[PDB]
Design an enzyme around this catalytic site. Structure first.
Site, PDB file in Angstrom:
ATOM      1  N   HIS A  73     -33.856 -40.378 -24.637  1.00  0.00           N
ATOM      2  CA  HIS A  73     -33.602 -38.940 -24.734  1.00  0.00           C
ATOM      3  C   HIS A  73     -32.121 -38.588 -24.492  1.00  0.00           C
ATOM      4  O   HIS A  73     -31.605 -37.686 -25.141  1.00  0.00           O
ATOM      5  CB  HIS A  73     -34.487 -38.171 -23.754  1.00  0.00           C
ATOM      6  CG  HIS A  73     -35.936 -38.385 -23.981  1.00  0.00           C
ATOM      7  ND1 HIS A  73     -36.565 -38.024 -25.175  1.00  0.00           N
ATOM      8  CD2 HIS A  73     -36.842 -38.994 -23.185  1.00  0.00           C
ATOM      9  CE1 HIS A  73     -37.844 -38.376 -25.027  1.00  0.00           C
ATOM     10  NE2 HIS A  73     -38.049 -38.982 -23.864  1.00  0.00           N
TER      11      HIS A  73
ATOM     12  N   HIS B 214     -43.763 -44.610 -31.308  1.00  0.00           N
ATOM     13  CA  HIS B 214     -43.614 -43.517 -30.367  1.00  0.00           C
ATOM     14  C   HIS B 214     -42.149 -43.116 -30.207  1.00  0.00           C
ATOM     15  O   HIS B 214     -41.866 -41.920 -30.101  1.00  0.00           O
ATOM     16  CB  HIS B 214     -44.231 -43.847 -29.005  1.00  0.00           C
ATOM     17  CG  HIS B 214     -44.214 -42.633 -28.118  1.00  0.00           C
ATOM     18  ND1 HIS B 214     -45.165 -41.634 -28.266  1.00  0.00           N
ATOM     19  CD2 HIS B 214     -43.320 -42.252 -27.179  1.00  0.00           C
ATOM     20  CE1 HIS B 214     -44.831 -40.677 -27.392  1.00  0.00           C
ATOM     21  NE2 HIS B 214     -43.705 -40.966 -26.766  1.00  0.00           N
TER      22      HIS B 214
ATOM     23  N   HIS C  30     -42.844 -33.974 -27.249  1.00  0.00           N
ATOM     24  CA  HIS C  30     -44.002 -34.264 -28.097  1.00  0.00           C
ATOM     25  C   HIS C  30     -44.461 -33.045 -28.858  1.00  0.00           C
ATOM     26  O   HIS C  30     -44.727 -33.123 -30.079  1.00  0.00           O
ATOM     27  CB  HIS C  30     -45.173 -34.898 -27.309  1.00  0.00           C
ATOM     28  CG  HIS C  30     -44.802 -36.176 -26.609  1.00  0.00           C
ATOM     29  ND1 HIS C  30     -45.671 -36.768 -25.703  1.00  0.00           N
ATOM     30  CD2 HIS C  30     -43.708 -36.967 -26.740  1.00  0.00           C
ATOM     31  CE1 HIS C  30     -45.052 -37.866 -25.279  1.00  0.00           C
ATOM     32  NE2 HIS C  30     -43.848 -38.001 -25.834  1.00  0.00           N
TER      33      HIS C  30
ATOM     34  N   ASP D  79     -40.544 -39.450 -30.579  1.00  0.00           N
ATOM     35  CA  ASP D  79     -39.723 -38.758 -29.571  1.00  0.00           C
ATOM     36  C   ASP D  79     -38.404 -38.269 -30.218  1.00  0.00           C
ATOM     37  O   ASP D  79     -37.970 -37.147 -29.945  1.00  0.00           O
ATOM     38  CB  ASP D  79     -39.334 -39.728 -28.446  1.00  0.00           C
ATOM     39  CG  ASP D  79     -40.380 -39.985 -27.386  1.00  0.00           C
ATOM     40  OD1 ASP D  79     -41.364 -39.179 -27.287  1.00  0.00           O
ATOM     41  OD2 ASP D  79     -40.235 -40.983 -26.660  1.00  0.00           O
TER      42      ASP D  79
HETATM   43  O1  LIG Z   1     -42.468 -41.010 -24.111  1.00  0.00           O
HETATM   44  C1  LIG Z   1     -41.408 -40.903 -23.479  1.00  0.00           C
HETATM   45  N1  LIG Z   1     -40.573 -39.818 -23.537  1.00  0.00           N
HETATM   46  O2  LIG Z   1     -41.113 -38.790 -24.354  1.00  0.00           O
HETATM   47  C2  LIG Z   1     -40.926 -41.933 -22.449  1.00  0.00           C
HETATM   48  C3  LIG Z   1     -41.586 -41.546 -21.061  1.00  0.00           C
HETATM   49  S1  LIG Z   1     -41.054 -42.756 -19.821  1.00  0.00           S
HETATM   50  C4  LIG Z   1     -42.364 -42.561 -18.661  1.00  0.00           C
HETATM   51  C5  LIG Z   1     -42.683 -43.701 -17.968  1.00  0.00           C
HETATM   52  C6  LIG Z   1     -43.631 -43.675 -16.981  1.00  0.00           C
HETATM   53  C7  LIG Z   1     -44.236 -42.474 -16.699  1.00  0.00           C
HETATM   54  O3  LIG Z   1     -45.122 -42.419 -15.658  1.00  0.00           O
HETATM   55  C8  LIG Z   1     -46.187 -43.280 -15.518  1.00  0.00           C
HETATM   56  C9  LIG Z   1     -46.521 -43.662 -14.235  1.00  0.00           C
HETATM   57  C10 LIG Z   1     -47.622 -44.477 -14.036  1.00  0.00           C
HETATM   58  C11 LIG Z   1     -48.386 -44.849 -15.132  1.00  0.00           C
HETATM   59 CL1  LIG Z   1     -49.790 -45.825 -14.922  1.00  0.00          CL
HETATM   60  C12 LIG Z   1     -48.047 -44.450 -16.403  1.00  0.00           C
HETATM   61  C13 LIG Z   1     -46.935 -43.672 -16.615  1.00  0.00           C
HETATM   62  C14 LIG Z   1     -43.938 -41.316 -17.379  1.00  0.00           C
HETATM   63  C15 LIG Z   1     -42.994 -41.367 -18.380  1.00  0.00           C
HETATM   64  C16 LIG Z   1     -41.305 -43.323 -22.980  1.00  0.00           C
HETATM   65  C17 LIG Z   1     -40.528 -43.685 -24.244  1.00  0.00           C
HETATM   66  O4  LIG Z   1     -39.119 -43.720 -23.940  1.00  0.00           O
HETATM   67  C18 LIG Z   1     -38.673 -42.410 -23.560  1.00  0.00           C
HETATM   68  C19 LIG Z   1     -39.389 -41.941 -22.308  1.00  0.00           C
HETATM   69 CL   LIG Z   2     -35.366 -41.902 -21.492  1.00  0.00          CL
HETATM   70 ZN   LIG Z   3     -42.551 -39.635 -25.736  1.00  0.00          ZN
END
Ligand SMILES: O=C(NO)C1(CSc2ccc(Oc3ccc(Cl)cc3)cc2)CCOCC1
Ligand SMILES: [Cl-]
Ligand SMILES: [Zn+2]
Ligand SMILES: [Cl-]
Ligand SMILES: [Zn+2]
Length: 267
Positions: free
Chosen positions: A252, A225, A73, A229
């Site tokens: 990713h 989003h 990000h 990314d």
């Molecule tokens: O933005 C991203 N990468 O930059 C992604 C991150 S996946 C990601 C998924 C879940 C997570 O933990 C969480 C646990 C609990 C809660 Cl309530 C909310 C979140 C943390 C991370 C999404 C788009 O696709 C690529 C991966």
């Molecule tokens: Cl991913």
């Molecule tokens: Zn992201």
């Protein structure tokens, strides 16, 4: 455009989405030719593909035993603003997630740009290329402007959505938040990730439901989003990029696979 740094040191802080730990960043000005690099415990970690150490659920960099999770990000914001020379000092193990989007970084950095004395040497995609992995696909091809499309095929009410970023429309992707599906959260927690995730920093969706009381910022916030990314992962080429990209279901891992193939081709 001209190479750019920041006018003065900029600080950000907060929990990291994966570690759940509170971390701090200090963005430092740097001279022409420095590039984008992170600094942690006395070690410089360039923001380049050679330093990628993990790509499942975030893009993480490391060098000499020092690791930083979730660089995508802040790198996307720097790529969109064409900041080319800066050191991101990290006190902690991950970049803060803030509200899940690039907004706070973008608004602060944009008001603190310092133009420098030479022009940027862009990474210019020279010819068409396609990378694939288990139904997911990314195509890159020449363009004089950065253009990035992401198409999703979601297994919930969102269905199929597509979004295209073009230069001049940075404000359309910098507010789009990270997102997760409720059925995938148990896996993320079980693999030692998502410790800082909450409804305050993630759009959480079910098969039919939106968990966040504030709802979606845009009806296609998730694909906006994913474009955001991909722009962050592309900056691991080590220079702002000129090319037209199309990602079908990319993540990713596939984004980094594309970057490594393009870098090898143009060595
Ligand atoms: O933005 C991203 N990468 O930059 C992604 C991150 S996946 C990601 C998924 C879940 C997570 O933990 C969480 C646990 C609990 C809660 Cl309530 C909310 C979140 C943390 C991370 C999404 C788009 O696709 C690529 C991966
Ligand atoms: Cl991913
Ligand atoms: Zn992201
Ligand atoms: Cl995993
Ligand atoms: Zn996983």
């Amino acid at each position: 455009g001209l190479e750019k740094t920041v006018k003065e040191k900029l600080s950000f802080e907060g929990v990291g989405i994966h570690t759940g730990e509170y971390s701090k960043l200090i963005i430092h000005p740097e001279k022409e030719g420095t590039g984008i690099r992170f600094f942690k415990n006395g070690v410089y970690i360039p923001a380049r593909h050679e330093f990628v150490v993990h790509t499942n659920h975030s893009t993480d960099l490391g060098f000499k035993g020092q690791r930083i999770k979730t660089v995508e990000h802040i790198l996307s914001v720097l790529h969109l603003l064409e900041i080319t020379n800066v050191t991101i000092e990290v006190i902690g193990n991950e970049i803060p997630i803030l509200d899940g989007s690039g907004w706070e970084f973008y608004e602060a950095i944009r008001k603190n740009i310092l133009n420098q004395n030479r022009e940027i040497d862009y990474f210019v995609v020279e010819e068409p290329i396609i990378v694939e992995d288990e139904g997911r696909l990314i195509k890159a091809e020449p363009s004089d402007t950065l253009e990035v499309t992401y198409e999703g095929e979601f297994k919930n009410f969102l269905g199929r959505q597509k979004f295209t970023f073009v230069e001049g429309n940075e404000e359309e992707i910098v507010l789009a938040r990270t997102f997760a599906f409720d059925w995938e959260i148990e896996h993320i927690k079980k693999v030692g990730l998502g410790k800082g995730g909450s409804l305050k920093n993630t759009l959480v969706l079910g098969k039919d439901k939106v968990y966040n009381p504030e709802g979606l910022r845009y009806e296609n916030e998730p694909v906006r989003h994913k474009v955001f990314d991909l722009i962050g992962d592309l900056y691991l080429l080590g220079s702002p990029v000129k090319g037209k990209f199309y990602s079908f279901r990319g993540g990713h891992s596939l984004n980094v696979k594309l970057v490594k193939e393009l870098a090898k081709k143009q060595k």
